[PDB]
Swiss-Prot record, chain D:
In plastids the minimal PEP RNA polymerase catalytic core is composed of four subunits: alpha, beta, beta', and beta''. When a (nuclear-encoded) sigma factor is associated with the core the holoenzyme is formed, which can initiate transcription. It comes from Nicotiana tabacum (Common tobacco). It is found in: Plastid, Chloroplast. DNA-dependent RNA polymerase catalyzes the transcription of DNA into RNA using the four ribonucleoside triphosphates as substrates. This is DNA-directed RNA polymerase subunit beta''. Belongs to the RNA polymerase beta' chain family. RpoC2 subfamily. It comes from the Eukaryota.
């Protein structure tokens, strides 16, 4: 809780490279991850990854708990790394009451709100649906960070739609004076969307994020991006490790397949269907390393 | 391993509205209240791609939440319901409109009544 | 075992135009703000007095407070750091997305930007990155609105000089720059437009510049260092004592090149501010030329600021031990003057420092006695001038010797790379208790005898010692060189019962050093020889047989009993064995 | 001494030995071909 992660990393080094009775445990890794996550000095995003690499010690009973997954989700969301945030949020969901621990009473940036907004901005709404239906099961209300844009239509149900930064037709004309009176004005202070010189987050949704909010993309863009990336890794696998296949019509099949796949990224469909990509299976790579595969 | 190696699903507007209706109903169940534009945009998306299967619920949720849209937009939906030949959906729409209490313009009212009598 | 956990963090950063004032601005009794240099001349001619508001002036520069106090000079026109722009890594060019050519032009030549600062609504649609010449109606547009009405808005669109770069770096949105750079990096390299080497090489250079820009922009978001501080709105001044200044006598000025550069830049700056204060309707050419002149001057100044024991011969002392060293009298007194003065003032025979110094200069026996009593057990450090080896710095115990040369041990001299020429030796004396304990327990010669390379003894016998040992253990002739005719046709020295008797007979000059003899060995059974069977075995009838070997004789009785053992050797081998054994035994006895 | 200085401060990997350069340029290619998983990068490194 000091703010300098080095004073905690020194203790962690004293514990890790010491005797057996002073070896660290899950709580020690959690404290050091918290010290490196909630700092206010520099990047500290590679240190957390190195520490999580050190935390891969199966035989030392170093297993993660709810707080470990919560801190990892928070750290990877605050640095705009969502493809690991969702991976760790799944494990946090496997435990009971993980969403309550992730929402640490709204004390530090409301990590649950930041995670929901990160899922909303990038348009990965299938993940958001899981993240939403995992909340009412644990009886967790929505945090007050339901930030609306200057155009009063921005919510978790608006970004993924095709029109972006566009008001929706609601029949009667927009009551600009009524919106001005309701949001503020005539008393106190109003959030004035005026650029300034100081390096302060202008948009109110970039309050918790370290650098800035992730790039705003609708669901169609994300779907086409994941489709083209799937086809790109398929062609990359078939290029080097896919010279031979079960079909013996390669002379006329490969010439068509290469051009089809290169034109898709920028009825002969089953030939690509049975193409099986071996990714994430450690047994396959172990067999290939042993010399069998 | 079960999800990482499965090929993704292609994009479609019907899938978009099918996920949007469930997202909005679960965020309402969770304790969140979307604004008028939040449902206006999903209504626009639902009327872009013809799908009158959810036209009743997308407005029943809005008029149960406590928000009402403008009059010049409740007629385009009811005339597109007849444009593609979905008269039962139009009957359901006028039924829930009478149940809610919104005043439909008399011109489109007699238009949909004539369409009904043509279907009757 | 918990460590002590010492934490020291030395932080570096670029100063701000506000923090620079916290160094030179000081308080005064009347309350007037001081710290600025406004006069070019620092000293008065033929007076040797510091001129007011100069370089070596007083009350803003001036005795360690004068060495630590600094000054500050305000500049009318902003200038830019030397290594932030001209160098190959151009951080400003990487932050402004513009090649070096135009910016160099803005800074040095006269070029114009369309709108450097974008924070207020602008109505002058220029869309010009760099204008080589001015073709606009500068006279009609300025005289149209109102006098002084053109000045209040000209800085938003028409900005020339380092102030334009400062205003451009000031209002730079560092959160959208990374977004645009990342989207450009994603768009680039995906089209797949091949070609020659000039194509992909340029593509790689562009993407490397883009990645470097992203890395530079991500730091400023979380480092509290603002990017508009790269230009020098205010210039620091080096303290006077850090600059070369010995004294001022009869108008003498010890100013160096940096001092004359500072004089030039302050002269040009005050002339520039006087020209600006005199008339504002002057020609732009002369004022822009002068501003360039000051800028190039301050750039050259910053570049110049960036770019800018008594040794005595050693002799060999054979009588000295391994730890003692011979220290000359004059060097010893010059080293321990402080200790001997303390000893004089401590007990008696001294009442003041002057009387003690006069007594020490008088060369009295009492001062030498006190010097010996002080240096009795005080360790001293000796270090050669060339410290090639790791054992070049050793500690010794000084012994008062007469002469002008330091006496050292032959083994240490051989281990310290002794030369034929006079090798200078530096003598250092520790003061604190910790230094003395470290020198007595770690740096002594008897604790460092193995070289750290592989572990071989660094202290080995020298040339003369090896020659002596070889002459001792060499022996003499054994065959045709000692006897003329064959011994088959026809006694040695008597059987010496002890080696003491052999050495006594050798000292009495009754046997030669090479004369063989028989030494009765006290059946130690450590018979050193080679795998060679005896030459003859005289097995008598009673049962006691003599086994005659090449170097010894074993007389064995019938029932397997070693009666007598005699060794045939010379006096050198037994002398060496006896001296080593007696050294070991004397060490073991003196230990108790 | 020049040999030590040029083998310590390596100007290029083929300067000390062409066999090492050939072996490295074979290792990287054959380990990008097979074992595309990060384990391949790890074992190649
Ligand atoms: Mg020499």
């Amino acid at each position: 809780t000091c703010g300098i992660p080095e004073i905690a990393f020194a203790t962690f080094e004293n514990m890790e490279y010491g005797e057996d009775h002073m070896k660290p445990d899950t709580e020690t890794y959690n404290w050091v991850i918290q010290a490196y996550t909630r700092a206010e000095s520099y990047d500290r995003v590679q240190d957390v990854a190195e520490l999580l690499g050190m935390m891969v010690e199966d035989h030392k009973r170093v297993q993660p708990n709810v707080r470990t997954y919560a801190l990892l989700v928070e750290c990877f969301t605050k640095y705009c790394v969502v493809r690991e945030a969702i991976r760790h949020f799944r494990g946090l969901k496997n435990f009971e009451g993980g969403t309550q621990v992730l929402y640490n009473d709204g004390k530090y940036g409301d990590p649950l709100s930041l995670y929901l907004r990160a899922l909303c901005r990038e348009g990965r709404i299938v993940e958001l649906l899981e993240a939403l239906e995992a909340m009412a099961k644990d009886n967790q209300p929505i945090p007050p960070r339901a930030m609306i844009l200057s155009r009063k239509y921005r919510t978790l149900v608006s970004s993924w739609i095709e029109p972006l930064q566009e008001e929706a037709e609601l029949g009667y004309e927009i009551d600009y004076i009524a919106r001005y009176v309701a949001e503020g004005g005539l008393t106190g202070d109003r959030k004035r969307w005026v650029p300034r010189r100081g390096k302060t987050p202008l948009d109110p949704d970039a309050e918790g994020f370290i650098y800035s909010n992730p790039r705003e993309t609708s669901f169609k863009q994300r779907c086409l991006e994941e489709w083209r990336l799937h086809h790109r890794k398929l062609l990359k696998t078939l290029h080097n490790e896919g010279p031979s296949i079960l079909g013996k019509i390669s002379e006329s099949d490969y010439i068509r397949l290469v051009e089809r796949l290169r034109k898709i990224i920028k009825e002969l469909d089953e030939l690509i269907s049975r193409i099986k990509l071996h990714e994430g299976n450690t047994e396959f790579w172990k067999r290939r390393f042993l010399g069998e595969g | 391993k079960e999800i990482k190696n499965k090929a993704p699903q292609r994009w479609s507007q019907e899938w978009e509205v099918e996920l949007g209706i469930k997202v909005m109903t679960k965020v309402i169940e969770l304790g969140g209240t979307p604004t008028i534009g939040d449902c206006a945009v999903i209504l626009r998306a639902a009327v872009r791609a013809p799908m009158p299967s959810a036209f009743l619920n997308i407005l029943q949720t809005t008029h149960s939440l406590g928000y009402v849209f403008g009059s010049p937009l409740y007629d385009e939906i009811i005339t597109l319901c007849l444009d593609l030949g979905e008269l039962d959906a139009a009957i359901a729409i006028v039924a829930d409109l009478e149940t809610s209490g919104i005043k439909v313009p008399d011109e489109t009212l007699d238009r949909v009544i004539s369409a009904r009598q043509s279907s009757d | 075992m918990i460590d002590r956990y010492k934490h020291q963090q030395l932080r570096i950063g670029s100063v701000s135009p506000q923090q620079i004032s916290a160094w030179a601005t000081k308080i005064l009794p009347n309350g007037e703000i001081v710290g600025e240099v406004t006069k070019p001349y620092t000293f008065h001619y033929k007076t040797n007095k510091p001129e007011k508001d100069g370089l070596f002036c007083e009350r803003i520069f001036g005795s360690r407070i004068r060495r630590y106090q600094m000054g500050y000079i305000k500049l009318a026109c902003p200038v830019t750091h030397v290594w932030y722009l001209k160098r190959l890594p151009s951080y400003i060019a990487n932050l402004l997305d513009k090649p070096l050519k135009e910016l160099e032009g803005l800074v040095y030549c006269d070029f114009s930007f369309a709108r450097p600062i974008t924070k207020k609504p602008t109505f002058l649609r220029l869309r010009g990155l760099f204008e080589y010449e001015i073709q606009s109606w500068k006279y009609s547009i300025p005289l149209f609105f109102t006098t002084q009405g053109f000045d209040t808005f000209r800085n938003r669109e028409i900005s020339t000089g380092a102030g334009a770069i400062r205003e451009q770096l000031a209002d730079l949105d560092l959160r959208i720059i990374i977004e645009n750079s990342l989207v450009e990096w994603e768009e680039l390299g995906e089209e797949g437009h091949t070609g020659n080497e000039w194509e992909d090489r340029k593509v790689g250079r562009r993407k490397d510049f883009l990645v470097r820009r992203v890395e530079l922009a991500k730091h400023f978001i979380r480092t509290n260092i603002e990017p508009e501080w790269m230009v020098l709105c205010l210039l620091p001044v080096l303290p006077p004592e850090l600059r070369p200044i010995i004294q001022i006598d009869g108008g003498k000025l010890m100013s160096s090149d940096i001092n004359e550069l500072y004089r030039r830049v302050i002269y040009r700056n005050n002339t520039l501010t006087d020209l600006l204060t005199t008339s504002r309707s002057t020609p732009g050419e002369l004022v822009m030329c002068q501003e360039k002149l000051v800028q190039e001057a301050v750039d050259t100044l910053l570049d110049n600021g960036i770019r800018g024991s008594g040794r005595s011969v050693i002799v060999v002392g054979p009588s000295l031990s391994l730890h003692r060293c011979g220290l000359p009298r004059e060097i010893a007194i010059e080293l321990f003057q402080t200790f001997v003065i303390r000893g004089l003032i401590r007990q008696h025979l001294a009442s003041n420092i002057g009387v003690a110094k006069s007594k020490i200069r008088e060369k009295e026996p009492i001062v030498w006695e006190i010097l010996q009593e002080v240096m009795q057990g005080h360790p001293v450090l000796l270090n050669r001038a060339p410290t090639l080896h790791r054992l070049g710095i050793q500690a010794f115990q000084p012994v008062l010797v007469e002469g002008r040369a330091i006496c050292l041990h032959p083994l240490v001299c051989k281990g310290f790379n002794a030369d034929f020429d006079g090798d200078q030796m530096a003598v250092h004396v520790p003061l604190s208790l910790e230094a003395q304990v470290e020198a007595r327990l770690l740096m002594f010669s008897h604790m460092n005898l193995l070289s750290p390379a592989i572990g071989d003894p660094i202290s080995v016998p020298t040339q003369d010692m090896l020659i002596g040992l070889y002459v001792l253990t060499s022996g003499n002739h054994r065959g045709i060189c000692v006897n003329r005719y064959n011994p088959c046709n026809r006694t040695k020295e008597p059987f010496f019962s002890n080696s003491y008797d052999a050495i006594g007979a050798y000292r009495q000059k009754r046997i030669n050093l090479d004369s063989p003899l028989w030494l009765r060995w006290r059946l130690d059974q450590r018979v050193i020889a080679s795998r060679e069977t005896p030459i003859e075995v005289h097995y008598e009838s009673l049962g006691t047989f003599y086994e005659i070997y090449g170097h010894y004789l074993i007389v064995r009785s019938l029932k397997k009993q070693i009666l007598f053992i005699y060794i045939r050797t010379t006096v050198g081998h037994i002398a060496l064995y006896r001296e080593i054994e007696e050294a070991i035994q004397g060490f073991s006895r003196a230990y108790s | 001494l020049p040999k030590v200085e040029q083998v310590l401060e390596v100007r290029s990997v083929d300067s000390i030995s062409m066999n090492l350069e050939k072996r490295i340029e074979g290792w990287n290619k054959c380990i990008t071909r097979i074992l595309g998983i990060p384990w391949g990068f790890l074992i190649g490194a």
